Scaffold this active site. Structure first.
Site, PDB file in Angstrom:
ATOM      1  N   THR B   1       0.900  -1.172   0.000  1.00  0.00           N
ATOM      2  CA  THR B   1       0.000   0.000   0.000  1.00  0.00           C
ATOM      3  C   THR B   1       0.933   1.216   0.000  1.00  0.00           C
ATOM      4  O   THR B   1       2.098   1.179   0.406  1.00  0.00           O
ATOM      5  CB  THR B   1      -0.864   0.056   1.270  1.00  0.00           C
ATOM      6  N   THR B  19      -3.544   0.560  -3.168  1.00  0.00           N
ATOM      7  CA  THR B  19      -2.918  -0.694  -2.800  1.00  0.00           C
ATOM      8  C   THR B  19      -3.170  -1.836  -3.787  1.00  0.00           C
ATOM      9  O   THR B  19      -4.083  -1.759  -4.625  1.00  0.00           O
ATOM     10  CB  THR B  19      -3.414  -1.141  -1.416  1.00  0.00           C
ATOM     11  N   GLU B  21      -2.880  -4.857  -2.032  1.00  0.00           N
ATOM     12  CA  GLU B  21      -2.973  -5.690  -0.820  1.00  0.00           C
ATOM     13  C   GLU B  21      -1.560  -5.999  -0.281  1.00  0.00           C
ATOM     14  O   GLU B  21      -0.884  -5.062   0.206  1.00  0.00           O
ATOM     15  CB  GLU B  21      -3.903  -6.914  -0.980  1.00  0.00           C
ATOM     16  N   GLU B  40      -6.609  -8.658  -2.896  1.00  0.00           N
ATOM     17  CA  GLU B  40      -7.407  -7.868  -1.943  1.00  0.00           C
ATOM     18  C   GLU B  40      -8.481  -8.673  -1.232  1.00  0.00           C
ATOM     19  O   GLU B  40      -8.858  -8.340  -0.126  1.00  0.00           O
ATOM     20  CB  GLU B  40      -8.065  -6.649  -2.632  1.00  0.00           C
ATOM     21  N   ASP B  43      -8.598  -9.817   2.440  1.00  0.00           N
ATOM     22  CA  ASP B  43      -9.018  -8.918   3.510  1.00  0.00           C
ATOM     23  C   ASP B  43     -10.396  -9.343   4.027  1.00  0.00           C
ATOM     24  O   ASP B  43     -10.786  -8.946   5.089  1.00  0.00           O
ATOM     25  CB  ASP B  43      -9.059  -7.453   3.038  1.00  0.00           C
ATOM     26  N   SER B  62     -11.571  -2.699   4.430  1.00  0.00           N
ATOM     27  CA  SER B  62     -10.246  -2.090   4.394  1.00  0.00           C
ATOM     28  C   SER B  62      -9.921  -1.438   5.743  1.00  0.00           C
ATOM     29  O   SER B  62     -10.804  -1.269   6.573  1.00  0.00           O
ATOM     30  CB  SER B  62     -10.199  -1.016   3.290  1.00  0.00           C
ATOM     31  N   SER B  63      -8.653  -1.098   5.956  1.00  0.00           N
ATOM     32  CA  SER B  63      -8.295  -0.198   7.052  1.00  0.00           C
ATOM     33  C   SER B  63      -7.712   1.106   6.521  1.00  0.00           C
ATOM     34  O   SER B  63      -7.215   1.948   7.296  1.00  0.00           O
ATOM     35  CB  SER B  63      -7.296  -0.859   7.989  1.00  0.00           C
ATOM     36  N   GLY B  83      -0.162   0.128   5.483  1.00  0.00           N
ATOM     37  CA  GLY B  83       0.167  -0.735   6.617  1.00  0.00           C
ATOM     38  C   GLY B  83      -0.922  -1.652   7.125  1.00  0.00           C
ATOM     39  O   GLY B  83      -0.834  -2.124   8.261  1.00  0.00           O
ATOM     40  N   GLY B  84      -1.920  -1.961   6.286  1.00  0.00           N
ATOM     41  CA  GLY B  84      -3.010  -2.867   6.707  1.00  0.00           C
ATOM     42  C   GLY B  84      -3.723  -2.389   7.966  1.00  0.00           C
ATOM     43  O   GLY B  84      -3.992  -1.201   8.115  1.00  0.00           O
TER      44      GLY B  84
END
Lengths: 359, 183
Positions: B1, B19, B21, B40, B43, B62-63, B83-84
């Site tokens: 990302t 991103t 992923e 992706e 997730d 998503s975050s 950074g997820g």
């Protein structure tokens, strides 16, 4: 020489790659707006920071329109294909396939949205053509550039999954990972960008590329079809807004968890007056960690795509809910079983889903 | 990302997180077209039934947290990070350090971060003091034996009184902030 802090009178660009920042800045110098520059930057990062983003993926693009004074989000988050199923990540025994194995399978591939997002952004706010904006990246892809340390470390770290696919010809020519300072050339990506330039986003969502992408996903075990690509469109999302310390904050709503839990953690922590503790004190880190446990528990329980599921936003951010959660936090003890709260006591309705712990 | 941001002379402001992923996504490249494919959909929850279960045509949670802060109805600060799940924490911390602690923006961005989403998942950056880690682990936290970088915040601040912009790139990558001064 590039710097990681700068100031300017007529605009500003900050990106993770100097070549992308250069391209974005160039757009602005030549009279383009922030949206034109952002589109140029995405293409540039697709080439120069190829492990992190690009037209194979999706994103959230928040734009404040200086004319209408409206803030909106182009949501190009990828969609699951029509052939996806709730149990597609389970083995025959109904247990989760290990994460590291899931990552490399065709079932993991969402219908890409980034390109559709860029097109929408230009349609809404653009003053420069996608043909102008993509051109510098076509040149970087065709002619190459010397790879930075972050890219070099990435190729090395991810050598195994790259070695299993067509990506090997680009990043591992002769079976060896490219090193910092080596030239990365991406002729096929250049060609794809030329097709987009000549034929528009149909070069991606339709035709021979769409068939090839679909067939490739299917070769790797996924269900994506050409119809899935044809069906794809972005969504325009309304930001979620909160107040913190005299600022209004516009942030990202479901299908991201990010905005709700940024606001929830700010609201929980605001009760503690953190500045009273030194910035490196154990007290500060304690309060951070305890708050994160509560909010991440709520996230796991209650967040998903709002086209599909009920995210109890009102409840999760209700000042009385915040109070309840904050009350769970002590300086001198740690919650050993932090759990989601019950935001449904602070709003109407109920979940249209269950509570299922993940492995 | 990756996360980037742009602001122009007409008052438009962009905060964009984007991103595929994982680093390199699935690793799959569309042959003869050079396009690296996202992973992706991982997730989504692997075990269905919950808010973030897989369904066809559904988007995975998503975050990503691209954010703009406003003061006196004008955009004044842009924040976001890769950074997820750690993203929410990186953006939180940058805002806390810049606003609650009143730290200058580059300093706020560089202040060592932590992240923990559960009792068995902890990260910290170099600079979180050792005795602090001893104290916290002493109460039952589970910080590990070495630091890791968390996030990569690019941020723009806007001074509407003085008519200036300030760009910041996080040292966790080789990013660049470039100001525009026309003529």
């Amino acid at each position: 020489e590039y710097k990681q802090v700068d100031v300017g009178k007529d605009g500003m660009v900050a990106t993770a790659h100097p070549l992308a920042s250069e391209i974005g800045a160039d757009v602005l110098k030549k009279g383009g707006n922030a949206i034109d520059a952002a589109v140029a930057i995405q293409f540039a990062l697709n080439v120069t920071e190829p492990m992190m983003s690009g037209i194979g993926g999706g994103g959230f693009m928040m734009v404040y329109d200086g004319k209408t004074k409206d803030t909106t989000i182009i949501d190009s988050r990828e969609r699951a294909p029509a052939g996806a199923t709730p149990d597609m990540f389970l083995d025959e025994n109904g247990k989760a396939i290990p994460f590291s194995e899931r990552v490399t399978k065709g079932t993991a591939v969402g219908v890409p949205g980034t390109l559709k997002g860029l097109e929408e952004a230009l349609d809404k706010w653009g003053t420069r053509s996608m043909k102008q904006l993509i051109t510098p990246s076509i040149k970087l892809a065709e002619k190459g550039f010397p790879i930075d340390s972050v890219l070099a470390e990435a190729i090395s770290d991810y050598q195994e999954k790259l070695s299993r696919t067509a990506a090997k010809d680009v990043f591992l020519p002769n079976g060896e990972p490219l090193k910092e300072g080596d030239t990365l050339i991406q002729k096929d990506l250049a060609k794809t960008f030329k097709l987009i330039r000549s034929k528009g986003t149909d070069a991606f969502y339709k035709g021979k590329f769409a068939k090839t992408l679909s067939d490739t996903v299917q070769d790797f075990g996924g269900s994506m079809t050409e119809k899935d690509l044809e069906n794809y469109d972005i969504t325009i999302d309304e930001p979620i807004w909160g107040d913190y310390q005299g600022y209004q904050i516009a942030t990202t709503p479901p299908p991201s968890s990010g905005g709700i839990f940024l606001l929830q953690m700010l609201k929980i922590l605001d009760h503690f007056n953190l500045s009273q503790y030194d910035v490196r004190s154990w007290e500060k880190y304690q309060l951070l960690a305890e708050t994160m446990h509560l909010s991440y528990a709520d996230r796991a329980s209650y967040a998903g795509d709002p086209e599909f599921v009920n995210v109890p936003l009102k409840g999760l951010l209700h000042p009385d809910y915040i109070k309840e959660r904050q009350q769970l936090i002590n300086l001198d003890q740690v919650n050993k079983k932090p759990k989601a709260g019950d935001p449904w006591k602070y709003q109407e309705g109920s979940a249209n889903y269950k509570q299922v712990e993940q492995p | 990302t990756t996360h980037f941001t742009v602001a122009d002379r007409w008052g438009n402001v962009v905060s964009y997180t984007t991103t595929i992923e994982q680093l390199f996504g699935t690793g799959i490249m569309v042959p003869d077209y050079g396009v690296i494919l996202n992973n992706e959909l991982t997730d989504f929850d692997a075990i269905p039934g919950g808010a973030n279960e897989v369904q066809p045509n559904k988007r995975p949670l998503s975050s990503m947290t691209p954010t703009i802060l406003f003061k006196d109805d004008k955009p004044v600060l842009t924040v976001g990070s890769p950074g997820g799940a750690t993203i929410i924490s990186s953006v939180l911390q940058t805002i806390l350090y810049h606003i609650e602690y009143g730290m200058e923006l580059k300093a706020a961005v560089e202040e060592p971060r932590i992240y923990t989403n559960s009792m068995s998942s902890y990260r910290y950056e170099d600079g979180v003091p050792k005795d602090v880690l001893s104290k916290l682990n002493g109460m039952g936290h589970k910080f590990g034996t070495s630091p890791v970088d968390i996030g990569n915040v690019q941020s723009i601040s806007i001074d509407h009184e003085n008519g200036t912009f300030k760009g910041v790139a996080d040292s966790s990558r080789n990013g660049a902030a470039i100001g525009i001064n026309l003529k």
